[PDB]
Design a protein around this nucleic acid. Structure first.
Length: 2003
RNA sequence: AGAGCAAUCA
RNA sequence: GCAAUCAGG
RNA sequence: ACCUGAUUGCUCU
């Protein structure tokens, strides 16, 4: 309903009553006129009487509404609005009855004068028309007479359609003529769009009904005529009437029936009507009928004006509009005139300007059959005014437009031959320009020569000049058995100077380092005799997260033991040592380069410029260095000898990996079916144990963890001594750089006690990094180089125990000879001394690969492994990159050796492939790249190894300044290339259309081809335009409030522009008081320092700044002089990005504003939050410029309160953006994406206005993508990718096998394509050209769409970030005085922003670009099918930047390859796609795109002949590298999702226990320390004596991943909790299986009996240990709600789990980001500074009173604006609500968490866990409701209760189940019993991507909701008084939550929801009126406790079948 | 010495 | 790595 | 002003 409509019907009552009285008079005059000539009864009499009674009905209705609405306009509250709405409804259905009656009156009037008069009928339908025509054909004798046998199968094959005609007639010309029928319709309208719509609807459903129906092998319509005749009279002037009649025969667009002239000409020569106007009609008075018809339209204007169009002929779907810019049109009413130059660019000689305009602005008549009404009127008015604005005479009517455009598509169709000869010409031109490289070695040499030209003298033969070999990390094996290692090293270093300084391969720094270590070991370090113990570190809880060891001087006592001053039992400083010792120590620090002498820094910075600039300091090696190859082979052999020297047998990593792989049969339920493969996994585990893979990576973790924690509050004159769990490893971790800045890091010295047995091999191993070594006793002491790691690199070293052992497992499975030797030999006989040379060499290479992949830390490995990502394109047909990719995109950045092994392995594979289900390796005999590994079993193994070594790498290893400068060099170069190519100037604006976008090469489209292709694509894709618009505005939340959209609500970054105003700078300088130099703090001091620094740098800029922004500039200049001459200020020199780091942001903003004034305005973007900025925009819309507490609460009560729409917010954005503000809205910030690559990609922060506009841009094409079957960006998760590529390859292979039966010739090809620069090289004005062709839109939001893209492209400029901008300005000021493309787009780096023009911002346009890529391939299809010689069929799969295009050819194949200048069909496919895309401004990359005959690579996971190469290695890498870092249970949950996906995508026999181990090590090592140390959970449970055994501890309680692999494959990552809960229910309720358990539970008063038995056992004291498990886990389930941190109101949360997170550590929340957040500013403003960090008690009391008064803002997602913006204010109330904001992300949070785990978080982690478990061991009363809902949740799971019996009773093998054994057991017994117990399939082998079958979130989401309601009620009542157990009769909500928390509130409301099923419709009024607490916190959740669902598991496609 | 190759962190 | 003070050059 | 030594504080403005 609409109150605006209810008011608009009131004031029109006078004219409505006059029109109704005139209607009554005209109807009575018509009745008298008919009755005086026909005294008998007529068919018009009944409808005339119905018209009369409905007319007096609406007369009484409008009288009553006019009487009632007198008080509504004065605002009286006693107006019956619902009664007025009901009367409006009665008015409207009475008017609908009169409209139908008037149509029937027209039909009965015209039906007398027909040449074929139809019989009078009331209800008519095409169905009965067709049945009666068929039986009349069967009965009557005619030429086209049907037979009796032919009668039945027409109706059998017939498909019914739903439409409502007006009449139908069957007519005979003569006795021996043909029987035919004519469909009659009677519609009345002024413009012929009704005629066109009705006639095309009738044509289309008759054609769809009779398309497949054939008579005697002929079409049905050829012999049997069906006629459609539609008659319209125009109700203006002299009442002209016309008939449009046509015969349906074929498709309408290919029929002669398309033209209106042929309709009226076919109406002629048969004389259907004898009538030109109704005054000719016999028996009717002309003036009476004309007055009555105009009289009806003079209420048809009014009723349709007020009530809109609620006609509903076929439910119409009520296409709404977008009103404010609705009246405007894309040309001459937008901000700039651009469509005219678009048209002038589009016009050619063959196709003219007026034709281009007509087609472009009127291609809606082609989709005219299924639009709603008045959309036609809006779009045609827009077309008419667009033609008027473009100075072309518009076509007057839709009929003439249709005849025009039919002739125009006839001339349009002869363009694809021109495009075909164009692409043939371009193919033959590109054939003669490419250069054939002779050999792969010469391609490598050419790439090396080009790299040497780019970087001079980089390659060197001096192998000693390279970087470090075995990373910055060494863990040698050791032989002896915390401080003991340290005194061992002290007794080692007390010996004399027999040290031997080492040459790098074949030295004052070495002497200096050896002296420093011998000083720090002899005269500095002492032992652990002191008993003060370690100091525990707390937080500060002001900025919660900053852990402090406190400045209270009890921590900084520094101690003593003689002369050492140790803290924390390992750190010691120097303060009272000798002066010679201090000089030696400082020379050690100078060689270490910790602490820069500024003299040396300035001297080096001047010297490098003087040395280099008169003629990049990279030192390189070549790819063909056989000396390096021999050195690396020695490196390998020495590493294998070194790794076997460990004798340790117990450890920490050894414990978890031995638990998960020593006996992995406990991960199954059928252990006895596979024996040798479990033995193979045990053999791999034993090889890792004996080779100390687990032990070595344990020292890797201890290394990294102690090295991170080794940066603390110490100064430069101290050092920590670090020890791992090794018996002889030690680091000297000195004073660092960061821990919070991401700088260089912590320098250290490594020392080792490798003995004489491994001394020489160790010297071959670490020769590049050994500085000195000397002999002590029977041992050798080795000292390594000074070494640094960044914090991300230390995290990379911390992920080593998840990285290295799974590398060994997967690589040793994929090594053929190693795997078959492991099957040959036995587990008790596998040893290091028992291989042959080949298998031993395989083991050396595989340990090298495991170590060298788990310890990547340099970008060279990124480079070679990206090269190997695109080095697998060789073995399939036309690759075109076996030489070209190596020549162009291979990066030779080999900065050391140990990557020359990878280069040699790939070069050996390259040379073997050059020497010449798909199995590669038995006949190719190729070589694996990382693990050499000959006799390759399957190409799947090679891609799994290579892609795992790619994806298992860390993310952000890039240096920030270099990465950002390269990532800003990319778009500046790619825009300057266009600007210098098409000849525009830097200073001048875009000049958008220069008409050089007409089929040229670099930046151009074809134009006319594009518009024809887009019209064809919309014709072939957009069906049911009205329904598509309806689901667009429904599903994409367009009419929903803007915060309801996840893309606009989710906490991302937007980077709005935010600078301080120059006026504020002026008065901040003016009110400065020089007498208050010591009183300035914060903002004024910041502005003063910025002005001082800018005066120190550039005086004239401030001179002109104050001249142009102030009148008395001399006062400001002399004030600047007085404030520099004061001497109380702290000036600064050039301190680069640290000047950004250690200062207020206000200083650098005023410094940049006063530095960058060149007659312009400069702005700096600050990265704000998306939700906070949307809150700001809601404030700006609703006119709260400043927040008022009463103004928000005074308006917005309930769902009837004030709201907004996304469209209204969008037009408010354009209203605020069209003003002249310098256009700071379209400013994009470039940031570094963490792309796991050497060549980095980038992420973008576009402003919130741009995000809203671009969300509209993108998501109005989301449903266009959804209706496209050949497109894969509208994907249902990641499953639709593989599924729809599977449909492509399966359908194409079936098509080829069909075409190979009885044909002359047929051929097949495929292309996997990656476009070169999908964003930078693409034209964007094709989007402007293509939005106008949308039939979904109308002019009024389409003009908004064009103006969006136009402003977004013309006024777009990217902005340099401030730190790298000032680095570039530093380079300008002191080194360069010249610059690259950034310094040419910018006027010599005097602006912080540079313009990019049509590089559309990558990743933000994902649906539009993919939709238009699919349109381009449809253009390719209709271009290539214009080949008259041959016939081609294609099926394409499209992603943003990615493509998979297939092709099938038949005909004169060899001749067509001769015309296409290709050796084969894949070659012609590659070249034709390249030329065709190059005509679409789509640059196909010739390197990373290969055309095959059997392989498809769409985005990944190549499928061959319909068999997907599984590629589980991406999940295997995601299981070890990426974790969430939020909690331990959260990390285990997130990694178990990837474990389940890994199992579902297929994994071999030996790698999944290692994957279980890897996710366990990642979660435990990060959060809750893995056993053998403190903060363990198994140790804490054993200490507290809980009855649970070690392998069923719940994961939220700190337990391990204990789920079996079958439920972890079928159920999901909650299967561990469900399995342990099912086990304890089966244990307590003493039964045997799940069916018996649920049968015992299904009878009531049984759980009551067991709970009373448990109560009696607890009373007596006879608590047996089975029941102790029961009390503990139901207390865990029942008190998992509150726990710690339940203040989060997370609805729609992840992890599909049962329990909660229990304990979550507080994230670091600085005050700087809080005070930067504007919503926190508004919070601190509306509630003052007493709540910013006794009156604060009353402040929070008021905030909780208005919590409890409106808890809808905090319970569920916001409804109105009184539920959202004040929710954003309330989001900072109390701690653990502020702990959900962090700009920390993944990389720097793990160091915070490992620092938090062993700290006081005041208690600590183990104290909190101990007190929590001690509280859960109690029997808090009335837990029966919790026990009942827990047992109900376990029992009700249908998928679990179907999986468990068929897993317990699964037959093992045979009978077409498990006839194979090669890794198909986790195919068959994982899914085939489950996927035949759940809806059936015919599959045996496949790959699996499942649904959301286990949607177990129906309990944990109300667990979170009941937690937040319980805890906000707890804050409220604990604030309102202390000692709350039962209240003192407060208000009703307080009494109800008292009832709630007197018992277990969560479990009582779960029981309450278990009986009741009320479920009110959530109107925010009635739900509050029924009852407050229990239904408002149960049924507001949009659901209740209900059942789960099971599906068919979605088996995508069949893998290769073995039987 | 180390991280990187935009002349940058120490 | 920074911040300021106190000295020396 | 610019560099070394002695003090305490920041260890994510």
């Amino acid at each position: 309903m609409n109150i605006q409509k209810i008011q608009k019907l009131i004031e029109n009552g006078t004219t409505l009553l006059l029109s109704i009285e005139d209607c009554v008079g005209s109807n009575y005059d018509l009745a008298l006129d008919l009755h005086k000539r026909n005294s008998d009864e007529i068919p018009e009499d009944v409808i005339i009487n119905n018209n009369a009674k409905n007319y007096e009905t609406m007369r009484e209705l409008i009288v009553k509404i006019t009487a009632d609405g007198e008080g509504l306009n004065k605002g009286m509250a006693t107006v019956d609005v619902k009664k007025l709405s009901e009367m409006v409804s009665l008015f409207e259905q009475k008017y609908l009855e009169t409209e139908l009656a008037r149509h029937d009156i027209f039909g009965e009037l015209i039906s007398r004068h027909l040449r074929i008069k139809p019989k009078q009928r009331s209800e008519v339908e095409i169905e009965h028309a067709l049945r009666e025509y068929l039986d009349e054909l069967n009965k009557k004798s005619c030429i086209n007479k049907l037979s009796d046998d032919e009668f039945e199968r027409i109706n059998k094959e017939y498909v019914a359609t739903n439409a409502t005609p007006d009449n139908y007639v069957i007519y005979k010309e003569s006795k021996n003529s043909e029987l035919c029928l004519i469909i009659y319709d009677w519609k009345i309208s002024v413009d012929a769009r009704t005629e066109t719509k009705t006639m095309e609807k009738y044509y289309k459903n008759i054609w769809k009904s009779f398309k497949d129906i054939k008579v005697n092998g002929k079409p049905f319509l050829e012999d049997h005529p069906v006629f459609v005749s539609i008659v319209i009279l125009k109700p203006i002037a002299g009442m002209p009437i016309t008939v449009t009649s046509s015969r349906v025969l074929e498709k309408f667009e290919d029929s002669p029936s398309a033209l209106h002239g042929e309709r009226i000409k076919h109406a002629r020569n048969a004389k259907l009507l004898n009538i030109s106007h109704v005054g000719q009609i016999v028996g009717t008075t002309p003036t009476v009928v004309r007055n009555y018809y105009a009289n009806t339209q003079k209420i048809k204007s009014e009723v349709r004006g007020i009530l809109g169009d609620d006609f509903g002929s076929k439910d119409v779907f009520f296409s709404h509009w977008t009103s404010k810019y609705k009246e405007r049109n894309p040309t001459e009413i937008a901000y700039s005139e651009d469509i005219e130059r678009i048209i002038d660019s589009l016009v050619t000689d063959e196709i003219t300007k007026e034709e281009i305009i007509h087609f472009l602005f009127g291609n809606f008549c082609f989709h005219i059959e299924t639009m709603n009404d008045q959309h036609i009127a809006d779009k045609f008015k827009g077309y008419q005014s667009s033609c008027i604005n473009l100075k072309i005479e518009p076509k007057v009517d839709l009929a003439d437009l249709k005849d025009h455009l039919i002739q125009k598509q006839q001339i349009w169709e002869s363009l694809y031959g021109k495009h075909l000869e164009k692409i043939m010409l371009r193919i033959r031109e590109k054939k003669k320009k490419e250069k054939e490289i002779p050999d792969i070695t010469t391609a490598f040499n050419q790439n090396a020569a080009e790299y040497e030209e780019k970087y001079p003298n980089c390659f060197t033969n001096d192998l000693s000049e390279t970087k470090t070999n075995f990373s910055m990390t060494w863990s040698p094996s050791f032989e002896k058995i915390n401080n003991a290692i340290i005194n061992k090293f002290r007794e080692s270093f007390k010996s004399s100077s027999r040290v031997i300084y080492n040459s790098p391969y074949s030295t004052n720094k070495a002497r200096d380092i050896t002296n420093l270590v011998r000083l720090c070991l002899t005269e500095l370090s002492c032992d652990t005799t002191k008993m003060e113990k370690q100091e525990l570190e707390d937080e500060i809880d002001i900025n919660t997260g900053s852990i402090k060891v406190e400045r209270t001087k009890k921590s900084k006592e520094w101690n003593k033991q003689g002369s050492c001053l140790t803290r924390n039992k390992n750190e010691f400083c120097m303060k009272e040592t000798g002066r010679e010792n201090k000089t030696i120590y400082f020379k050690g620090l100078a060689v270490m380069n910790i602490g820069m002498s500024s003299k040396k820094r300035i001297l080096k910075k001047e010297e490098i410029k003087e040395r280099i600039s008169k003629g990049h300091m990279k030192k390189l090696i070549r790819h063909d260095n056989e000396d390096s190859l021999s050195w690396c082979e020695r490196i390998k052999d020495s590493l294998f000898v070194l790794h076997n020297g460990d004798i340790r047998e117990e450890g920490k990593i050894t414990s978890v990996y031995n638990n998960y792989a020593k006996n992995p049969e406990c991960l199954y339920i059928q252990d006895s079916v596979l024996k040798t493969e479990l033995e193979t996994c045990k053999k791999i585990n034993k090889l890792c144990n004996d080779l100390a893979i687990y032990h070595y990576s344990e020292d890797m973790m201890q290394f990294s963890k102690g090295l991170m924690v080794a940066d603390r509050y110490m100064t430069k004159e101290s050092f920590k001594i670090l020890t791992t769990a090794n018996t002889s490893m030690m680091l000297l971790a000195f004073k660092g750089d960061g821990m919070n800045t991401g700088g260089s890091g912590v320098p250290y010295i490594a020392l080792h006690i490798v003995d004489e047995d491994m001394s020489d091999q160790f010297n071959i191993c670490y020769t590049k990094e050994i500085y000195s070594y000397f002999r002590n006793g029977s041992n050798y002491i080795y000292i390594m180089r000074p070494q640094r790691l960044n914090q991300v690199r230390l995290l990379s070293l911390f992920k080593t125990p998840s990285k290295v052992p799974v590398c060994f497992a997967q690589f040793s499975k994929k090594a053929n000879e190693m795997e078959k030797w492991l099957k040959n030999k036995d587990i008790e006989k596998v040893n290091v001394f028992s291989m042959t040379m080949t298998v031993k060499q395989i083991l050396i290479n595989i340990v090298f690969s495991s170590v060298m992949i788990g310890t990547v830390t340099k970008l060279s490995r990124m480079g070679i492994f990206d090269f190997m990502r695109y080095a697998g394109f060789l073995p399939l047909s036309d690759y075109s990159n076996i030489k070209e990719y190596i020549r162009d995109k291979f990066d030779p950045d080999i900065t050391n050796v140990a990557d020359i092994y990878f280069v040699n392995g790939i070069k050996k594979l390259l040379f073997r492939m050059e020497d010449l289900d798909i199995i590669g390796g038995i006949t190719d005999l190729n070589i694996k790249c990382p693990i050499t590994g000959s006799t390759l079993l399957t190409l799947e193994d090679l891609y799994n190894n290579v892609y795992l070594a790619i994806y298992m790498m860390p993310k952000s290893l890039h240096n920030h300044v270099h990465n950002l400068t390269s990532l800003l060099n990319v778009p500046a170069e790619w825009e300057l290339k266009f600007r210098k190519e098409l000849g525009f100037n830097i200073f001048e604006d875009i000049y958008p259309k220069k008409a050089m976008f007409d089929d040229k090469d670099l930046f151009s489209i074809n134009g006319a081809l594009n518009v024809k292709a887009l019209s064809d694509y919309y014709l072939g894709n957009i069906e049911n335009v009205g329904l598509m618009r309806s689901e667009i505005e429904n599903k994409e939340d367009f009419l929903s409030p803007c915060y309801k959209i996840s893309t606009l609500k989710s906490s991302k970054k937007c980077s709005q522009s935010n600078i301080i105003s120059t006026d504020e700078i002026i008065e901040c300088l003016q009110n400065a008081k020089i007498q208050d130099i010591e009183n300035w703090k914060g903002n004024n001091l910041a502005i003063i320092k910025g002005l001082i620094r800018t005066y120190n740098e550039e005086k004239n800029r401030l001179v002109e700044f104050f001249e142009d922004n102030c009148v008395n500039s001399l006062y400001l200049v002399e004030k600047l002089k007085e404030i520099i001459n004061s001497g109380s200020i702290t000036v600064g020199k050039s301190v680069t990005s640290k000047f950004i780091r250690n200062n207020h942001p206000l200083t650098v903003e005023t410094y940049l504003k006063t530095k960058l004034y060149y007659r312009n305005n400069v702005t700096v973007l600050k990265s704000k939050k998306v939700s906070e900025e949307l809150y700001d925009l809601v404030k700006q819309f609703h006119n709260m410029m400043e927040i008022d507490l009463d103004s928000v609460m005074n308006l917005g009560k309930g769902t009837e309160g004030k709201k907004h729409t996304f469209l209204q917010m969008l037009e408010f954005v354009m209203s605020k953006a069209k003003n002249v503000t310098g256009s700071v809205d379209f400013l994009v910030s470039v940031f570094e994406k963490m792309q796991r690559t050497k060549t980095d990609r980038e992420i973008y922060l576009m402003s919130m206005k741009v995000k809203m506009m671009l969300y509209f841009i993108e998501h109005t094409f989301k449903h266009v993508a959804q209706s496209d079957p050949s497109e894969a960006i509208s994907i249902s998760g990641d499953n639709k990718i593989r599924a729809l590529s599977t449909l492509s390859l399966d359908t194409i292979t079936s098509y080829n096998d069909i075409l190979n039966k009885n044909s002359k010739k047929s051929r097949l090809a495929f292309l996997s394509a990656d476009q070169s620069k999908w964003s930078a090289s693409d034209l964007t004005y094709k989007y402007v050209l293509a939005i106008i062709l949308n039939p979904i839109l109308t002019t009024g939001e389409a003009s908004l769409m064009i103006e969006c893209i136009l402003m977004y492209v013309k006024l777009k400029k990217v902005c340099i970030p401030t730190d790298i901008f000032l680095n570039l300005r530093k380079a300008q000021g002191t080194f360069g005085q010249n610059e690259t493309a950034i310094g040419l787009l910018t006027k010599g780096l005097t602006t912080n922003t540079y313009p990019v023009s049509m590089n559309w911002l990558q990743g933000n346009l994902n649906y539009l670009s993919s939709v238009y890529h699919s349109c381009a391939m449809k253009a390719y299809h209709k271009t290539l099918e214009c080949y008259k010689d041959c016939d081609f069929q294609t099926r394409w799969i499209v992603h943003s930047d990615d493509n998979a295009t297939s092709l099938i050819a038949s005909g004169e194949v060899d001749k067509m390859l001769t015309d296409f200048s290709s050796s084969s069909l894949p070659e012609m496919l590659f070249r034709s796609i390249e030329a065709h895309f190059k005509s679409f401004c789509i640059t196909l990359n010739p390197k990373k795109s290969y055309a095959s005959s059997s392989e498809v690579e769409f985005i990944s996971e190549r499928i061959v002949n319909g068999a997907i190469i599984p590629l589980y290695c991406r999940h295997l890498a995601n299981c070890c590298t990426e974790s969430s870092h939020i909690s331990y249970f959260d990390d285990l949950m997130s990694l178990s999702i990837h474990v389940t996906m890994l199992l579902r995508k297929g994994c071999p026999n030996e790698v999944i226990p290692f994957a279980y181990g890897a996710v366990q090590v990642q979660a435990l090592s990060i959060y809750s320390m893995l056993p053998g140390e403190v903060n363990d959970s198994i140790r804490i449970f054993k200490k507290l004596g809980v009855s649970l055994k070690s392998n069923e501890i719940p994961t939220n309680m700190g337990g391990w991943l204990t789920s079996p692999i079958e439920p972890l494959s079928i159920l999901g990552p909650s299967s561990n909790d469900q399995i342990i809960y099912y086990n304890v229910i089966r244990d307590f309720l003493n039964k045997k299986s799940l069916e018996e358990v649920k049968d015992s539970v299904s009878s009531s008063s049984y759980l009551q009996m067991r709970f009373r038995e448990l109560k009696g056992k607890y009373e007596k004291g006879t608590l047996e240990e089975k029941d102790k498990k029961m009390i503990f886990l139901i207390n865990l389930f029942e008190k998992a709600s509150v726990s710690e941190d339940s203040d989060v109101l997370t609805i729609g949360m992840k992890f599909q789990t049962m329990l909660t997170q229990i304990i979550k550590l507080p994230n670091f929340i600085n005050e700087n980001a809080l005070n930067k957040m504007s919503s926190y500013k508004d919070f601190s403003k509306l509630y003052p500074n007493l709540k910013k960090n006794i009156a604060s008690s009353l402040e929070m009391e008021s905030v909780h009173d208005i919590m409890i008064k409106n808890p809808e803002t905090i319970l569920i997602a916001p409804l109105n604006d009184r539920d959202f913006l004040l929710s954003q204010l309330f989001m900072y109330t109390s701690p653990s609500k502020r702990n959900q904001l962090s700009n920390q992300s993944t990389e720097k949070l793990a160091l915070d968490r490992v620092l938090r785990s062993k700290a006081r978080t005041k208690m600590t982690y183990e104290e909190n866990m101990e007190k929590k478990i001690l509280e859960m061991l109690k029997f808090d009363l009335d837990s029966y409701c919790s026990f009942k809902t827990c047992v109900n949740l376990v029992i009700k799971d249908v998928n679990f209760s179907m999986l468990i019996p068929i897993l317990d009773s699964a037959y093992p093998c045979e009978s077409r189940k498990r006839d194979n054994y090669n890794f198909r057991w986790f195919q068959t017994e994982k899914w085939i019993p489950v996927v035949e117990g759940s809806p059936g399939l015919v599959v045996m082998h496949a790959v699996y991507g499942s649904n959301y079958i286990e949607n177990l979130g129906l309990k944990n989401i109300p667990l979170t909701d009941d937690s937040i309601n319980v805890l906000t009620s707890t804050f409220g009542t604990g604030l309102i008084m202390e000692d709350v157990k039962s209240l003192v009769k407060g208000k009703d909500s307080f009494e109800t939550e008292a009832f709630s928390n007197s018992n277990e509130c969560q479990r009582l409301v779960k029981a309450c929801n278990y009986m009741i099923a009320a479920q009110n419709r959530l109107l925010a009024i009635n739900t509050c009126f029924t009852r407050k607490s229990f239904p408002f916190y149960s049924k507001f959740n949009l659901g209740r406790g209900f059942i789960s669902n099971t599906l068919a598991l979605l088996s995508t496609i069949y893998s290769k079948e073995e039987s």
